[PDB]
Design a protein around this nucleic acid. Structure first.
Ligand SMILES: [Mg+2]
Ligand SMILES: [Mg+2]
Ligand SMILES: [Mg+2]
Ligand SMILES: [Mg+2]
Ligand SMILES: [Mg+2]
Ligand SMILES: [Mg+2]
Ligand SMILES: [Mg+2]
Ligand SMILES: [Mg+2]
Ligand SMILES: [Mg+2]
Ligand SMILES: [Mg+2]
Ligand SMILES: [Mg+2]
Ligand SMILES: [Mg+2]
Ligand SMILES: [Mg+2]
Ligand SMILES: [Mg+2]
Ligand SMILES: [Mg+2]
Ligand SMILES: [Mg+2]
Ligand SMILES: [Mg+2]
Ligand SMILES: [Mg+2]
Ligand SMILES: [Mg+2]
Ligand SMILES: [Mg+2]
Ligand SMILES: [Mg+2]
Ligand SMILES: [Mg+2]
Ligand SMILES: [Mg+2]
Ligand SMILES: [Mg+2]
Ligand SMILES: [Mg+2]
Ligand SMILES: [Mg+2]
Ligand SMILES: [Zn+2]
Ligand SMILES: [Zn+2]
Lengths: 91, 214, 97, 25, 97, 202, 127
RNA sequence: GGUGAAAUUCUUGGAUUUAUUGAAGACUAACUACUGCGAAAGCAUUUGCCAAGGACGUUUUCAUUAAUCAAGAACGAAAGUUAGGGGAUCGAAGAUGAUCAGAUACCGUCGUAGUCUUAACCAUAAACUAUGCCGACUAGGGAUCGGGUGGUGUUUUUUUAAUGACCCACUCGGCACCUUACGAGAAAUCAAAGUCUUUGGGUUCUGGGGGGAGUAUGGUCGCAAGGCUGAAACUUAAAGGAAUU
């Protein structure tokens, strides 16, 4: 039974702060509570707490990542750049 | 009341081994004044002379060569290889309507670890009985020819020290090996390497440079 | 009413073709609709040819020309270049000469 | 007047009556 | 493909999924080939690799996580390692693998 | 606490005494528990390792870089920041980098950095939404919140104070040569007003 | 036989540029151009101007030492008319006619794999 | 430097030019055509990967499963909007130099958004062939794209083939042109706009003088701009189309 038409988690804020502020939050809020896939163990159990810190339910591995998401776009490009330049200095 | 003409020194340019003539021309630099003398600041230059002037015959009217200048001694600055191009007009004259163009290229190294990228152009040809006025290829012909051109070009390079690649290009050896493997696919008149650029060279090695000198 | 079966130039079965920028006024114009002329002309001219091979090394040696395409924007192609007008049934004829 | 400029004309004219009517919603 | 043949082995031969059983299968000399998922932690890979050569069993490093290998063996759960006990009409035992 | 970015506790062996020695790094995004970190001139070019800016090709992306060798890390430490190597002068062994502010410094090639970016990035994208969130923020940094505006104070209190309406009264661009009790407003401001046009230094 | 050099005539419209350099390029000599020999700002490119500047050109060209020179003619190019200006055909003439020698000239008009939208908007420079 | 001609501008800061080299983003020149493909928008550098498609070949298979479609839905140029990135180029806005009686423009300088990209919206273009889809029939011609069949056709030589490209005849299915016109039309023209007063193959949609007006109003979608749906009172003898002079 569809409870809200657009606020979603952001319904906690009731009417306050103005629609465009809550939209911006709802986005990062959904980003920051969600269960993510563990690159190490496979299962989808990387949750957050303390922006930047992402740890896995079982196998208990903790990955530094983005403030509200596990891999921030920039970090991911920086990876491939570091890949790129590394392989430049093996051959 | 200066006229640096009364001031500049002169110099004469010498070409490398694998050509006909080595005497190129002259140049102006400066007085070899200590603290920015006429040696270290410049002469790491190039010269664009058509190899038909560097070989002599006119079956070489196109095909410009760049000669980078690397070492200097006693009014005599020997040069090495830096690149090769085509005259604008030649290309402009090969590209005619009613026919397919085909270009391919590859980056590749050598023993003497000069990395480079060679090019390759080729146009279709009409069979000499052909009635239909345009004679295009099949875009799978086109992909195959590039594969073979890319098959053939990768072997010539990394075949020993572009100075031999020099000795490989000057007599147009590559051009026919292309056309030979090609004839099974499409006619392809007007095949040339058409270009090669130089992008990374290894450490100076004053020894090997004087291999083409005397 | 309509006054050209081609509506303009050379496009049936396609829907959209990329434009070109006029060589005189830089107006955009679809390539299928853009009056074109190959510019082939020597470097030297009617008179400088004799003056060329006179004070020159390499006997006459090539005389290589310059080659390029031109793209006109009917507005420009009419102002100077090759149409000027054709009559009703003169319009149809696509013989170059 | 050019058809499209008369389109823009009445576009604005609507946005003003749209606006004016809202003083009273 | 390498999946293509695994998929055959799944449908015509015998196998076992998981870590405890492939070792029971390595100790009994039964495994003809074990397949190790990319993300399987090294220590397990090491131990399987050690158990392998003691059994003189060949090892194929599946380029892929356990989530994918479970798909390749046609299962809806994740699998970290596989043990081919008998290859069916497939040829993985005697191909480039 | 009071930090944008997570830290990374990284234990090494004491080459000179039998003991462990724990260091506190700023976690570079992507590093993880149980990872091996490599710190040294002759170390390899992976996210997490610490390498002297001379030993990395240009285009490299390093964080927590020292301004003089061995000062144990000054530049690019806030959540999401880094510096980019943009060239080397092997003789004099300098290295040119671009800091997060856009300014381009040139420091020793023996200055050390750690390959990657700092974790916790994008934190400032989320609105605070309310005083309390700000409150708890500054509750853990310093007593800098909330801010009364000098323009709502009496003249005893501020260069901007007083008047019968609230108004700054004189140019709020104060000069460098100003003196304590004078510098409030836009100190040394060489331009002012809404920044039209694109930013991002050439 | 002679002593070589490069001419590199850039003859756009509204000016023409003739200047000789070493066959290597890094060292230039004797530049004076077509806007240098008239003062009308509408005759800054006319052949009659590039001529008088070709005369001054070859002067230092021999007063320094070049008895022969190859030319590399060139228009504006890039995203422009791609076509030779009027004061190029005058200049080449009035520099070979100055007792200089000519060998193996070509064109160096920059021509792109088209891009970088031309100036003046999709409707054209309408005048 | 730029232009009809000028001027605003750039120049001890060595401009413009030259040379060697580097960085950024965008674009894909010449080849390019009465050339291909996609439902349309639209699609033009290489290579790898991913699934997709028509035509064709067919003594395979299923056997009426189909045609066209209110509601509903996928996609949908450019611009424009939200949030990041990007921001070379050209460039609404604005500011200028000129021109002008004036000149808020045309021309020149600067140049904000924009132009590119990711996630999301927006759903409109002369989105055009101003021409619905399926089926049948009605008339000649020479080019071409794809597929196929026929060959003591040419060309490649190696030792002759095989190949590949080329030539000739035919046959499907494409994009188009030519010439006629039985026929059609108000004509311009049209192998469909033909096979209609000798008026019926199936089906979807829209129009009913011109203004008023795609306006008012309600409903609905949209962050917005705006999209869809959409009247009337009143006014008016023309408005319009094609061809001739
Ligand atoms: Mg008309
Ligand atoms: Mg068109
Ligand atoms: Mg269209
Ligand atoms: Mg009110
Ligand atoms: Mg306080
Ligand atoms: Mg306050
Ligand atoms: Mg304040
Ligand atoms: Mg007060
Ligand atoms: Mg004061
Ligand atoms: Mg005071
Ligand atoms: Mg006050
Ligand atoms: Mg105030
Ligand atoms: Mg401009
Ligand atoms: Mg006009
Ligand atoms: Mg191209
Ligand atoms: Mg309904
Ligand atoms: Mg911009
Ligand atoms: Mg204005
Ligand atoms: Mg004005
Ligand atoms: Mg205005
Ligand atoms: Mg419409
Ligand atoms: Mg149209
Ligand atoms: Mg039609
Ligand atoms: Mg056949
Ligand atoms: Mg027919
Ligand atoms: Mg609403
Ligand atoms: Zn895990
Ligand atoms: Zn034009």
């Amino acid at each position: 039974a569809k409870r809200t038409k657009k606020v979603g988690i952001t319904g906690k804020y009731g009417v306050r702060y103005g629609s465009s502020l809550r939209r911006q939050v709802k986005k990062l809020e959904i980003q920051q509570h969600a269960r993510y896939d563990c690159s190490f163990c496979g299962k989808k159990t990387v949750k957050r707490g303390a922006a930047g810190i992402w740890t896995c339910s079982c196998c208990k591995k903790t990955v530094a990542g983005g403030a509200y998401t596990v891999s921030t776009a920039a970090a991911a490009t920086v990876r491939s750049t570091i890949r790129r330049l590394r392989e430049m200095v093996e051959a | 009341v200066v006229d640096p003409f009364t001031r500049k020194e002169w110099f004469d340019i010498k070409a490398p081994s694998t050509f006909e003539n080595r005497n190129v021309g002259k140049t102006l630099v400066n007085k070899s004044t200590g603290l920015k003398s006429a040696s270290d600041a410049l002469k790491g230059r190039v010269v664009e002379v058509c190899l038909a002037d560097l070989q002599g015959s006119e079956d070489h009217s196109f095909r410009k060569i760049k000669l980078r200048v690397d070492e200097v001694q006693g009014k005599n600055l020997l040069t090495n290889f830096h690149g090769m191009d085509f005259t604008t007009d030649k290309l402009r004259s090969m590209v005619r309507k009613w026919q397919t163009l085909i270009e391919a290229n590859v980056t590749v190294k050598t023993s003497d670890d000069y990395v480079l990228r060679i090019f390759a152009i080729a146009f279709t040809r009409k069979q000499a009985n052909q009635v239909k006025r345009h004679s295009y290829a099949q875009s799978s012909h086109i992909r195959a020819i590039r594969k073979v051109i890319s098959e053939i070009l990768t072997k010539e390079v990394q075949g020993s020290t572009l100075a031999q690649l020099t000795s490989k290009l000057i007599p147009e050896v590559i051009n026919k090996e292309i056309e030979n493997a090609t004839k099974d696919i499409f006619p392809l008149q007007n095949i040339h390497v058409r270009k090669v650029k130089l992008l990374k060279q290894p450490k100076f090695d004053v020894g090997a440079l004087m291999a083409l000198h005397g | 009413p309509k006054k050209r079966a081609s509506n303009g130039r050379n496009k049936k079965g396609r829907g959209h073709v990329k434009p070109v920028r006029c060589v005189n006024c830089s107006k955009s114009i679809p390539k299928d609709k853009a009056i074109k002329r190959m510019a082939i002309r020597n470097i030297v001219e009617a008179a400088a040819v004799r003056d060329l091979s006179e004070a020159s090394v390499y006997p006459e040696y090539a005389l290589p020309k310059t080659y390029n395409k031109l793209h006109y924007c009917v507005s420009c192609a009419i102002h100077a270049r090759i149409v000027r007008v054709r009559s009703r049934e003169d319009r149809k004829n696509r013989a170059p000469p | 007047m050019r058809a499209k400029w008369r389109k823009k004309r009445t576009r604005r004219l609507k946005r003003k009556r749209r606006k004016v009517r809202a003083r009273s919603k | 493909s390498i999946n293509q043949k695994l998929a055959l082995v799944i449908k015509s031969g015998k196998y076992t999924l998981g870590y405890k059983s492939t070792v029971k299968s390595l100790r009994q000399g039964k495994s003809k080939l074990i397949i190790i998922a990319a993300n399987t932690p090294v220590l397990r890979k090491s131990e399987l690799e050690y158990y392998a050569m003691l059994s003189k069993t060949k090892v194929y490093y599946f380029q892929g996580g356990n989530n994918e290998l479970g798909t390749a063996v046609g299962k809806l759960f994740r699998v970290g390692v596989v043990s081919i006990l008998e290859a069916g009409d497939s040829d993985i035992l005697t191909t480039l693998a | 606490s009071g930090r944008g970015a997570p830290l990374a506790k990284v234990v090494f062996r004491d080459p000179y005494k039998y003991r462990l020695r724990e260091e506190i790094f700023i976690a570079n995004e992507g590093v993880h528990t149980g990872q091996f970190i490599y710190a040294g001139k002759k170390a390899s070019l992976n996210v997490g390792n610490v390498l002297p800016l001379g030993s990395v090709p240009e285009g490299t992306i390093v964080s927590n870089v020292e301004e003089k060798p061995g000062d144990r890390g000054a530049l690019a430490r806030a959540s999401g920041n880094y510096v980019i190597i943009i060239g080397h002068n092997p003789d004099e062994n300098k290295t040119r980098v671009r800091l997060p502010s856009g300014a381009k410094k040139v420091i020793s090639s023996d200055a050390r950095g750690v390959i990657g970016v700092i974790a916790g990035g994008g934190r400032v994208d989320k609105p605070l939404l309310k005083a309390g969130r700000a409150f708890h923020k500054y509750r853990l940094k310093r007593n800098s919140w909330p801010k009364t505006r000098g323009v709502a104070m009496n003249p005893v209190d501020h260069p901007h104070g007083g008047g019968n309406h609230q108004h700054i009264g004189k140019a709020s661009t104060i000069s460098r040569g100003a003196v304590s009790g004078q510098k409030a407003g836009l100190i040394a401001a060489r331009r002012t007003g809404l920044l039209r046009g694109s930013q991002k230094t050439q | 036989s002679q002593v070589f050099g490069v001419a590199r005539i850039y003859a756009s419209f509204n000016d023409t540029f003739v200047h000789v350099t070493d066959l290597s390029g890094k060292e230039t000599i004797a530049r004076v151009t077509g806007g240098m020999k008239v003062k009308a700002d509408r005759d800054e490119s006319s052949p009659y101007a590039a001529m008088l500047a070709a005369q001054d050109v070859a002067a230092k060209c021999k007063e320094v030492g070049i008895t022969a020179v190859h030319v590399k003619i060139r228009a504006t190019g890039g995203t422009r008319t791609k076509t030779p200006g009027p004061g190029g055909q005058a200049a080449l003439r009035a520099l070979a006619r100055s007792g200089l020698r000519i060998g193996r000239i070509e064109d160096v008009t920059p021509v792109p794999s088209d891009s970088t939208r031309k100036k003046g908007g999709r409707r054209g420079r309408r005048l």
